[PDB]
Design a protein around this ligand. Structure first.
Ligand SMILES: Cc1ccc(Nc2ncnc3[nH]ncc23)cc1
Ligand SMILES: Cc1ccc(Nc2ncnc3[nH]ncc23)cc1
Ligand SMILES: Cc1ccc(Nc2ncnc3[nH]ncc23)cc1
Length: 186
């Protein structure tokens, strides 16, 4: 099946816990894969305008590890629940992708999760202004705008709303698109 196939592709890029013990400032993100209408999509958040860090920008759910977290995956799952109401029984964590090094002292670990078909997002308005889906195939032929810095524009055909996707978020999205969709019969 489509889901069987996705998970088998993702498994081959799993680094697991290899870089998890290093002495960084530690954050995790969850990349949430949703099946709709015969196709895979990624779920994104728009950050609330009131936050200190990057108000109004597009990102994956996530945040800073805390002493309660059993491991780095736990951080991503805690944060996803708090931000958009995703419960643990509604997600299968499939792998841990390459971590992102920033600012000389910080390591951000991305996890890919398959989302239950009955999940409906309940955004916490203190953290998240909006939630939207993008088909995964979009990231193979995106609409690119140079700010020089590459920025993607995605227009939701349901309501005509345009979102800007950039930085680490845009990089991770293209990576997941390549892993799952490259080299497939039609
Ligand atoms: C998409 C996105 C989400 C959060 C941030 N946060 C930060 N940006 C800059 N410096 C920071 N220091 N601690 C956090 C932090 C940046 C981008
Ligand atoms: C220095 C620094 C530290 C943390 C971040 N955080 C994030 N960066 C990107 N997406 C994110 N989603 N949730 C959090 C988060 C960015 C920069
Ligand atoms: C809540 C939730 C629980 C489990 C899954 N996983 C799968 N579901 C169906 N087929 C699959 N094939 N590989 C994995 C997989 C998705 C969401």
């Amino acid at each position: 099946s489509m889901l069987d196939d996705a998970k088998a592709r993702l498994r081959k890029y799993d680094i697991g816990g290899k870089y998890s013990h290093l002495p960084y400032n530690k954050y995790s993100v969850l990349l949430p894969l949703v099946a709709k209408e015969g196709k895979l999509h990624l779920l994104f958040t728009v950050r609330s305008e009131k936050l200190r860090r990057a108000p109004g920008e597009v990102c994956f759910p996530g945040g800073k590890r805390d002493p309660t977290d059993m491991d780095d995956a736990a951080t991503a799952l805690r944060e996803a629940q708090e931000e958009v109401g995703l419960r643990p029984h509604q997600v299968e964590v499939v792998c841990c992708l390459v971590p992102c090094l920033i600012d000389t002292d910080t390591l951000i670990t991305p996890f890919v999760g398959l989302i239950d078909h009955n999940f409906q997002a309940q955004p916490n308005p203190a953290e998240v202004k909006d939630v939207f889906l993008v088909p995964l195939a979009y990231f193979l032929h995106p609409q690119v705008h140079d700010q020089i810095n590459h920025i993607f524009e995605y227009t939701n055909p349901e309501d005509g709303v345009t979102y800007q996707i950039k930085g680490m978020t845009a990089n991770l999205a293209v990576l997941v698109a390549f892993i799952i969709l490259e080299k497939k019969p039609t």
